[PDB]
Design a protein around this ligand. Structure first.
Ligand code: SRM
Ligand code: SF4
Ligand SMILES: [K+]
Length: 453
């Protein structure tokens, strides 16, 4: 079961409702935070009465959860951007393939815009949103050994004033609906349509349908994709506590009652929670006076157990035991895999550094390995394709480096590479960029044509 929850914003009352249902009516008893800012129940033995009762609804609707940057550095921008994510979500509610949309607040790309069909990049002036840069056509799904499939980054269309948001959102969806491949589902996605007809042709039709003309793209840059683990100062006397939750799996573990700790926080929390695109949770809008109380519960529940920057910047999809399409373990493999990576980082004197490392259970790519600096794509039990060369901000697809290898083989490759990066990297140079500069891996410059060797 998966819920519609634009921007990952969920109330504490709604949380208590899902917490109950998870514990009592499911086989696993867990709440699994997803990387699209929502949650899932696993092994449902209905839910819709419970969801509906707290103002929630589980999503032929070819639409997924609309994402929104969860913790902007310019705190006051969130309310507006969030309002827009909710409106787009409602506006699109009832396509060839499924349609994924986001609202991004630079300089953060935590929502990983390049994995989505439609992206509205917020442009603000004097603390107020004035418009959006539209980027269209991202998607990560591939099929092993099938060179007709490819991961693709989103293309810039142009800038549009806030007022034209919904019309533009509608024009993109309808154009894709009409132009999308009407036979082969594995080529129906927007990324394929754009490559077939061309960005300008698609862009022109969108302008025609929306009744507008796109303005030149307004400047924007991204500095990262990670969450801001810990306390950050929000607006007023408010603070936001982001908790690192490994694999977003919320369950009570012996000596680490993560699920109960969150229920306890939900009961005393003023504001609401925010599920992030990195499968973490933000206890949002905590008044300064409440910080200590909240911190006490989170601390004792094991929710604030310190982890390395590496673990904080690693991600995996659900995979086994519940995913029917799984080829290799992802969620269940990640913890110990990162234990090994942590050793390698210490051995090389870079324990304070991080590499955006992701493991996806099969090429469908839910773990977003195809936008990682180091991506592992499951091929069979215990075997993965190793991709290198993405960057920290997620604007480049990593090329396949080694194919169908096992963990021991993966660690050996990374031990050597991390060692080279540690001694050869320039000031503040990321691992991915380093592999590309050092000639370790050829970059992917135009995915539709050069992703496959
Ligand atoms: C939970 C999540 C991974 C995670 O650990 O967070 C997930 C889990 C699954 N995804 Fe997904 N996907 C998740 C994000 C994505 C992503 C990343 C993103 O959206 O940011 C992608 C890659 C980007 C893209 O779409 O290109 C993604 C691409 C897919 C695909 C391939 C779609 C395609 O266009 O080919 C499938 C398979 C399909 O739909 O045919 C799929 C299918 C599925 C299913 C529902 C398998 C199925 O069809 O029965 C998996 C459920 C496993 C389980 O046991 O829970 N999922 N999946 C995310 C659910 C997000 C959500 O709340 O909606
Ligand atoms: S990438 Fe494959 S294994 Fe992982 S959750 Fe998605 S469909 Fe399942
Ligand atoms: K996480």
């Amino acid at each position: 079961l998966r819920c519609r929850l634009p921007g990952g914003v969920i109330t504490t009352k709604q949380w208590q409702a899902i917490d109950k249902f998870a514990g009592e009516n499911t086989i696993y008893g867990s709440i699994r935070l997803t990387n699209r800012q929502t949650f899932q129940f696993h092994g449902i033995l209905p839910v819709h009465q419970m969801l509906h009762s707290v103002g929630l609804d589980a999503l032929n609707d070819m639409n997924r959860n609309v994402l929104c940057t969860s913790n902007p550095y310019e705190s006051q921008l969130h309310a507006e951007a969030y309002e827009w994510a909710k409106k787009i979500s409602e506006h699109l509610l009832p396509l060839p393939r499924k349609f994924k949309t986001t609202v991004v607040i630079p300089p953060q790309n935590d929502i990983d815009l390049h994995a989505n069909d439609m992206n509205f990049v917020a442009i603000a002036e004097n603390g107020k949103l004035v418009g959006f840069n539209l980027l269209v056509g991202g998607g990560l799904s591939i099929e092993h050994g099938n060179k007709k499939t490819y991961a693709r980054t989103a293309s810039e269309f142009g800038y549009l004033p806030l007022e034209h948001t919904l019309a533009v959102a509608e024009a993109v969806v309808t154009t894709q609906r009409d132009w999308g491949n009407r036979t082969d589902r594995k080529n129906a996605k927007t990324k394929y349509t754009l490559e077939r007809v061309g960005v300008e042709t698609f862009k022109a039709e969108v302008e025609r349908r929306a009744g507008i003309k796109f303005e030149p793209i307004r400047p924007y840059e991204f500095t990262g994709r990670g969450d801001r683990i810990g306390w950050v100062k929000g607006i007023d006397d408010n603070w936001h506590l982001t908790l690192f939750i490994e694999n977003g799996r919320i369950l009570d573990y012996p000596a680490r009652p993560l699920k109960t700790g969150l229920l306890e926080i939900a009961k005393i929390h003023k504001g609401d929670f925010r599920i992030t695109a990195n499968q973490n949770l933000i206890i949002a809008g905590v008044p300064e006076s409440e910080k200590a109380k909240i911190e006490k519960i989170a601390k004792e529940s094991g929710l604030m157990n310190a982890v390395t920057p590496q673990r904080e910047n690693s991600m995996a999809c659900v995979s086994f035991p519940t995913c029917p399409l799984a080829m290799a373990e992802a969620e269940r493999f990640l913890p110990s895999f990162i234990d090994n990576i942590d050793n390698l980082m210490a051995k090389h004197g870079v324990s304070d550094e991080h590499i955006v490392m992701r493991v996806t259970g099969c090429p469908n790519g839910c773990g977003r390995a195809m936008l990682a600096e180091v991506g592992l794509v499951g091929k069979a039990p215990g075997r993965y394709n190793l991709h290198l060369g993405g960057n920290r901000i997620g604007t480049r697809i990593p090329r396949m480096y080694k194919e169908n290898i096992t963990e021991p083989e993966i660690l050996a490759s990374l031990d050597e590479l991390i060692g080279r990066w540690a001694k050869e990297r320039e000031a503040g140079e990321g691992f991915g960029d380093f592999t590309v500069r050092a000639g370790i891996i050829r970059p992917v410059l135009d995915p539709a044509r050069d992703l496959w060797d």
